[PDB]
Design a protein around this ligand. Structure first.
Ligand SMILES: Nc1ccn([C@@H]2O[C@H](COP(=O)(O)OP(=O)(O)OP(=O)(O)O)[C@@H](O)[C@H]2O)c(=O)n1
Ligand SMILES: Nc1ccn([C@@H]2O[C@H](COP(=O)(O)OP(=O)(O)OP(=O)(O)O)[C@@H](O)[C@H]2O)c(=O)n1
Ligand SMILES: O=c1ccn([C@@H]2O[C@H](COP(=O)(O)OP(=O)(O)OP(=O)(O)O)[C@@H](O)[C@H]2O)c(=O)[nH]1
Ligand SMILES: O=c1ccn([C@@H]2O[C@H](COP(=O)(O)OP(=O)(O)OP(=O)(O)O)[C@@H](O)[C@H]2O)c(=O)[nH]1
Ligand SMILES: [Mg+2]
Ligand SMILES: [Mg+2]
Ligand SMILES: [Zn+2]
Ligand SMILES: [Zn+2]
Lengths: 148, 310, 147, 310, 310, 310
């Protein structure tokens, strides 16, 4: 059945949008470990047609670590696994703040080329999500922040 | 300790109605009863990474009126370190080992906030960070309204000029919207309209605001007429001349003004207020400037002193 | 098998640990609609541990294999079709490396400009030296790699 | 009177081991027990003919911490007199009729020495004269070593970076060579090697020094790792990138460092020390900068006050 | 003689449709068969009171391609000396005794028109006067559209970017409005909309135009996509970043573009056209710049040579 | 066509010995019999992004001596405006639609090479790219040696001065190393030695070279004494003064010089050649500069004219 076999224990992030799995591995430094990791990209899915999938053994994510996925993989399923059984399923929910991973689109923001981590207050609108920079205090569409 | 002791003063967004009232009460008190030795033996850094003579003179005078010593710089580019390679982070890490408080003005938004992350236990006061915040200007503006009007609630406030790029009008509107029953009149060319994000903020709090083509539309009702600079250098010279007429104030415009009405302007004024206004009892822009001393003293005293003796 | 066999495509085996993700990034291997399966930190009999990259319906040209040499010089590029390994190759040091490197010379024209980086490669005194096409400066590969 | 009362402070070459110890003892004392009125009624000239914001802020803060008043200038070229025709001799002849001490930084070697010849009974403190001396930087460096290490003798001191053009490393090496049993490790590209005249000085005193290609060669044994700036603008951009790797410090390099080891840097640091070092207990460059206040206060107190009350 | 012989070329509003067609016909002919000695023994002044390397190189190359000699200057060199003591009138009164034609660019609107009043018999060609006119840019734009589309009537023209402050798009719109059946699509942020005096002009002539917030709205219908540069000045950094995605073109935006559609841009295109567009068959901004040579040759030939070039 | 027809001239390392001999043969011919109309109707761009009066005057004179027209600019004029918004790629993409060849000088290494990638059919001649290449200087140097020595093989060549940072001596050494039997003598302070990558190159080819601390060591054996300027920047004032006497030539140093020996210097020679050398028969630096005209004419003719000049 399975190209990427079941694991005894750790975390499986399922239901990741195509072209987003690699993004997650990169942005969240997921491969910076010695633990065994198995990945499937462009896998078929019933519920989404085509998906990415990341398994990380002997590793678990907190609730906000899962929530930090919300912006890139809102319908992801994070499965906790021990002794071969899914002992927990959770789903990302918009966090109150997003640190480190975003870049402020204000070219005059002090955040650029200074030894600080980016930080954004999160608030859902209606047809997007607004991101307000901790430093320059400007608020942007998530669609603007996420792009170039 | 008072609620502002050892706090950073970075943004009007971080200050509550209670905070603003405390600063203003303290400013009235120091105005009435100066304490020239309050900050004796304190050394304060006056760090103008972006030069601003008037704000700097004002801030340094406030330091001296409380007896503090002052070290600092003002930077065109002419300054050693100075415009080049060292991070602001490192500059603050160093200076915060020297002094008891850092007052700083910088061309980049967020610069004062970044400074707080490296200043350890040394308080940072933002004297202007790019197009973001200038909280002491807002505090002196608020102090002036409160002193002349007797209150910060249920006011009719007109704002006139470049409402789009005026960081001081955005901050003042945000601050007044922490109080109840205020009503705003915005008078600006369409190219320089008060931004939608401010309007949405007002709408959410159920605060009334409306647009008007001229000052005479609302002169009868206004308590505070807050005039801003309109920098020609971001309008077409032809465009500016085409639109200036409705954002320029002369003594004759004040004929049906209320007895309490004050005209404010953060300065410099160039074209926006004719000199014949100066002698009217409504002119209050130089008094406003004067009040910067008391608002800035109040902030320094509260931040650097646990319990205000008075 | 944790990452099962494929019918047709390329299997890059024997990648050093902590080099598999780097390869995915540098060479944009995941910018495709084809099914990719990956193992990182897998046990290896000959290496202790390794990384592993499988790209279905996809084959690498010879110079594409050779671009791996600076990062995974002992890698094994296997071509697969109908579940059978039809070819094995090991990267050889290429004579030029384009696109992925960054010239260490801060005054090189390459930085501010719409051009791909390019370096000529010379394994010489048993060091690998990389010469920038633009500024014509030559650097140790260790200096070019850090930047 | 103390041995430094009314003395000029121009060169580390003029200061004895006893002199250095006195300054350092006095700095520890003022650090522990400040004397904010010690120099009350003294006026000190802060004369930066060559601009240096960090040194100037440091020096002026020290003046204010002792209660002195400060007059001065900082000169790009923008300053009346100011870059042109009047001799330095005349400038000093005038200023020394105004003030109680002159702190001066100048782009020409020997400028502070020349000043002493025209300042009459007014003490001159050299805050940097071209590529020659910067004695207060050395004193703050020494104070920092002494405070963290408990001594200035029998130390293992590594110096890393531009050892050829660093006036601060030459002076520090000269000063430490006034003490006994110190051993030096010099880590620098061949183009920026510690000069032969310094090496000959060490050889004559039987002081051990050796060259090393990397910091890891000596990390296990080092007490003080003194990192210097390497100004790209005197290496080829290609040359710099070719050689920087062995003169750049990261937290990972500190794995086998002794518990007492401190990393120093006169600042600004740009590339030479990664920010991950900052949080290690070995990072001491901002503390070092902080110590400039106490070393500079000690110097001013000793020079301007006969008998240190303590 | 030909209709433009010895005429001044100051404003697109002074050139009729027939004049425009004549310049373009002459440009096509000189492109097909050069006349390298047509203006032999002519001396032309290239007077760039305001510097513009690209416009100046283009104009001077055109002079040389016709065999004329060139004298001139580029300015903004009274950087801190100040503005003229001497009037532009006097400068032109003198230069017009030297040369056979004057090509001039100047920071003030109307400068070329004033020049014609002092140049006597000598023709003045306007290479740009402030935010007023830039007729040869419009001529090369028109020539490029005519060449790639085969006509200047019944076209669907999109203009994108700073439509408010672009003298080049105002002129091109006025020029295309001299022809019949053209349809306009204006894509601009609200702050930078095509001015009303332009829309009124189109309305008087019964010419259809519409506003759009995005290029994709119109891509499938456009024959010409005329992009302009959004000046960072004209905006706040944060504002610019919020709007940018609208006025920026990348190759993927062209998927539904008509096979004949050409993308133009008067240059520099720094941000608004991604380099991936360059290799598409639609990219025509460098060819456009190339056509500046033939448009400017044509104008020089017609103004200075009595008989039509054939 | 001739081997250099329509070729880019970017680097000495791309020119074979045959190419070098061809340029020099062509230079000799044009010196003997000028061809003032060879490039009639050609337009050449003289693009000095980095200013260089002497190189630019030389190159433009060469263009005119062949009858070509010239358009161009000299820069470092974005003095405080800033670096380009527009890419060098775009500048070249535009200019290459204007002219028949581009001669360019630029402060960044690789700039001319990048230009070739955007210039299409238009040849690019490198007049200097940072510390990388300066091929026409090497060509004029070679032509001068060939003319005065009668050959480019079996020569004894001394190079003196800043051998470390002189792009001109690196290139001349690489060029002479394409010929046979040449012997090198490198006279330089330790801080400014000929780089190892050069010595390795000579070692691969079995070419003899030796280091000397003084010109007299080698004077009696040299055919060419190639002097370079020691940049005061590259050193400290005191260091420069300690070393100067080694790399400085005066007439008395030439007493044992061979009758055929010529002294060359790419200029300016400010310090290193005393004016008393000028009237000796060995002084050949002005004749050398003169030969720049013929070397640059030769290159322009070969690149732009299909057939060999005969
Ligand atoms: N020991 C295990 C158990 C399960 N999984 C993986 O974890 C995910 C969730 O397991 P499961 O709930 O059993 O699959 P589904 O029923 O499809 O769950 P969902 O509805 O979330 O898709 C699946 O991708 C499965 O392959 C695993 O890798 N190792
Ligand atoms: N249909 C197949 C066949 C092989 N492989 C993979 O390709 C690699 C090499 O194949 P193979 O020659 O069968 O394995 P080895 O004998 O171990 O070869 P080597 O000595 O190179 O390790 C192994 O990772 C194997 O799992 C695969 O993914 N799909
Ligand atoms: O752990 C896994 C899960 C899935 N897969 C591979 O992914 C594909 C789907 O296998 P699934 O098991 O995920 O089917 P599914 O219906 O549960 O999918 P969802 O709707 O929940 O998204 C199959 O091709 C399978 O081989 C793995 O290789 N490993
Ligand atoms: O295609 C593969 C190959 C290997 N693996 C997994 O990697 C581990 C090694 O399996 P291998 O099959 O690669 O063993 P090996 O002896 O050939 O190792 P090498 O020296 O050739 O490197 C095993 O745990 C196996 O499950 C896969 O999951 N998929
Ligand atoms: Mg499922
Ligand atoms: Mg195997
Ligand atoms: Zn920001
Ligand atoms: Zn390079």
């Amino acid at each position: 059945k399975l190209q990427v076999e079941a694991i005894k224990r750790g975390t499986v992030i399922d239901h990741i949008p195509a072209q987003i799995g690699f993004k997650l591995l990169s942005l969240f430094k997921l491969t910076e470990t010695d633990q065994r990791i198995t990945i499937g990209l462009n896998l078929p899915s019933g519920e989404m047609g085509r998906k990415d999938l990341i398994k990380i053994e002997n590793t678990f994510l907190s609730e906000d670590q899962v929530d930090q996925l919300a912006l890139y993989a809102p319908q992801a399923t994070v499965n906790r696994i021990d002794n071969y059984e899914v002992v927990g399923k959770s789903r990302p929910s918009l966090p109150e703040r997003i640190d480190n991973v975003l870049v402020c689109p204000n070219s005059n923001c002090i955040s650029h080329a200074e030894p600080v981590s980016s930080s954004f207050a999160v608030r859902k609108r209606a047809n997007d999500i607004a991101l307000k920079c901790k430093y320059c205090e400007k608020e942007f569409s998530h669609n603007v922040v996420l792009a170039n | 300790a008072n609620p502002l002791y050892q706090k950073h003063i970075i943004s009007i967004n971080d200050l509550s109605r209670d905070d603003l009232n405390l600063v203003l009460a303290t400013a009235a008190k120091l105005k009435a009863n100066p304490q020239p030795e309050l900050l004796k033996h304190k050394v304060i850094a006056s760090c103008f990474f972006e030069a601003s003579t008037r704000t700097r003179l004002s801030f340094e005078t406030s330091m001296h009126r409380l007896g503090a010593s002052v070290v600092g710089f003002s930077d065109s580019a002419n300054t050693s370190l100075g415009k080049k390679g060292e991070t602001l982070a490192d500059t603050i890490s160093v200076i915060s080992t020297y002094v008891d408080a850092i007052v700083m003005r910088h061309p980049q938004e967020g610069a004062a906030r970044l400074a707080t992350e490296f200043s350890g236990n040394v308080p940072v006061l933002n004297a202007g960070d790019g197009s973001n915040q200038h909280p002491t200007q807002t505090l002196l503006d608020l102090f002036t309204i409160q002193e002349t009007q007797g209150r910060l609630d249920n006011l009719h406030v007109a704002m006139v000029g470049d409402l789009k790029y005026g960081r001081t009008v955005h901050s003042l509107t945000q601050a007044l919207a922490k109080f109840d029953g205020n009503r705003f009149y915005f008078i600006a060319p369409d190219a320089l309209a008060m931004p939608q994000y401010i309007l949405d903020m007002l709408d959410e709090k159920g605060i009334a605001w409306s647009l008007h083509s001229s000052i005479e539309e609302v002169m009868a009702e206004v308590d505070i007429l807050y005039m801003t600079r309109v920098q020609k250098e971001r309008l077409d010279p032809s465009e500016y001349a085409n639109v200036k007429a409705q954002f320029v104030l002369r003594a004759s415009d004040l004929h049906n003004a209320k007895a309490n009405m004050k005209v404010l302007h953060p300065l410099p004024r160039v074209d926006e207020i004719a000199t014949d206004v100066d002698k009217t009892p409504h002119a209050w822009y130089f008094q406003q400037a004067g009040n910067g001393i008391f608002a800035r003293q109040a902030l320094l005293a509260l931040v650097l002193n646990r319990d205000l003796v008075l």
